[PDB]
């Protein structure tokens, strides 16, 4: 503890020096620091460094980077209430001729990137948990579209780092062929396949967003946003957006359930047609 404290004091008391570097990284906590601090600490503890291991001192609370024995350079990371301080000490941090300064700078940059990614992931997880617990899609979690707008402590998040544009991209995408009987539903312009999918997914569909559902995987505890669209040969195109790659619960089981519902609807329609002894199409 006292050696790390002295190194941090020397780094802070020598700004702009070629041997000591101090960097401050803010933690954009959408839900506040009370819940974000524990998540950030856990992520930092579970964070992995290339060729280095982070040891957290319990007396001081500041993590130190060591070779995985102390290396030729000292890297110290301090986690405050709402900011992260990274201190790097080396003989020459400016020279990059295969020395310890270049390695220390690369390690500091990697640690800063990992901390930023961890903060973003914590914010996304908090937003997903709030959406799952409230069945409402926040603007920061996903931007409100024109259809959603027509059918419609986060103030700092709105007046902070750009929200809405940080929504997770479509992790997986699939196209499901729609049968000829289900191509036209009971309402003009509404496919029967779309209606069946809505009826199936009403258990997790978003009220404020049309044809949108929020599904939380049981294994990964990750809430993902599913969007379904009709593509014309009418078909159902489903895009699943999540922080990480979609698991097998949504990739396979959900597709199987949707296919089973579509097949049941087609079989019921065919039975109704045969009840009237109507001519059956070769596709039917």
Swiss-Prot record:
Tissue expression per record: Expressed in the brain, predominantly in the parietal and frontal cortex, as well as in dorsal root ganglia. Expressed in peripheral white blood cells.
Subcellular location, record wording: Lysosome membrane; Peroxisome
Signal peptide annotation: none
Function, in words: As part of the KICSTOR complex functions in the amino acid-sensing branch of the TORC1 signaling pathway. Recruits, in an amino acid-independent manner, the GATOR1 complex to the lysosomal membranes and allows its interaction with GATOR2 and the RAG GTPases. Functions upstream of the RAG GTPases and is required to negatively regulate mTORC1 signaling in absence of amino acids. In absence of the KICSTOR complex mTORC1 is constitutively localized to the lysosome and activated. The KICSTOR complex is also probably involved in the regulation of mTORC1 by glucose.
Self-association state and partner proteins as the record states: Part of the KICSTOR complex composed of KPTN, ITFG2, KICS2 and SZT2. SZT2 probably serves as a link between the other three proteins in the KICSTOR complex and mediates the direct interaction with the GATOR1 complex.
Disease per record: Developmental and epileptic encephalopathy 18: A severe autosomal recessive neurologic disorder characterized by lack of psychomotor development apparent from birth, dysmorphic facial features, early onset of refractory seizures, and thick corpus callosum and persistent cavum septum pellucidum on brain imaging.
Descriptive protein name: KICSTOR complex protein SZT2
Gene: SZT2
Portion of the full sequence shown: 1717 to 2207 of 3432
């Amino acid at each position: 503890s006292p050696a790390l404290h002295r190194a941090a004091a020397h780094i802070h008391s020598s700004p702009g020096r070629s041997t000591c570097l101090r960097q401050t990284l803010p933690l954009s906590f959408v839900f506040g620091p009370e819940r974000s601090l524990t998540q950030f600490k856990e992520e930092f503890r579970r964070l992995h460094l290339p060729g280095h291991v982070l040891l957290e001192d319990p007396d001081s609370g500041f993590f130190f980077v060591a070779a995985g024995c102390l290396p030729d350079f000292w890297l110290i990371v301090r986690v405050l209430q709402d900011r992260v301080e990274v201190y790097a000490h080396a003989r020459s941090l400016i020279r990059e001729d295969g020395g310890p300064g270049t390695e220390c700078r690369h390690l500091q940059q990697l640690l800063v990137r990992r901390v930023g990614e961890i903060c973003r992931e914590v914010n996304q997880r908090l937003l997903l948990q709030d959406l799952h617990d409230s069945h409402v899609c926040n603007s920061l979690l996903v931007a409100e579209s024109e259809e959603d707008l027509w059918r419609s402590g986060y103030l700092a998040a709105t007046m902070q780092f750009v929200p809405g544009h940080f929504s997770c991209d479509v992790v997986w995408g699939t196209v499901i062929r729609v049968h000829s009987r289900l191509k036209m539903g009971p309402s003009m312009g509404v496919s029967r396949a779309i209606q069946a999918l809505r009826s199936v997914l009403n258990a997790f569909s978003v009220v404020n967003r049309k044809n949108m559902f929020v599904y939380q995987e049981r294994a990964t505890k990750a809430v993902y946003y599913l969007r379904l669209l009709e593509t014309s040969d009418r078909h159902i195109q489903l895009l699943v957006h999540g922080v990480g790659q979609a698991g097998p619960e949504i990739t396979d089981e959900l597709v199987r359930v949707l296919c089973r519902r579509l097949d049941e609807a087609t079989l019921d329609v065919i039975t109704v047609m045969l009840v009237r002894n109507c001519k059956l199409t070769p596709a039917d």
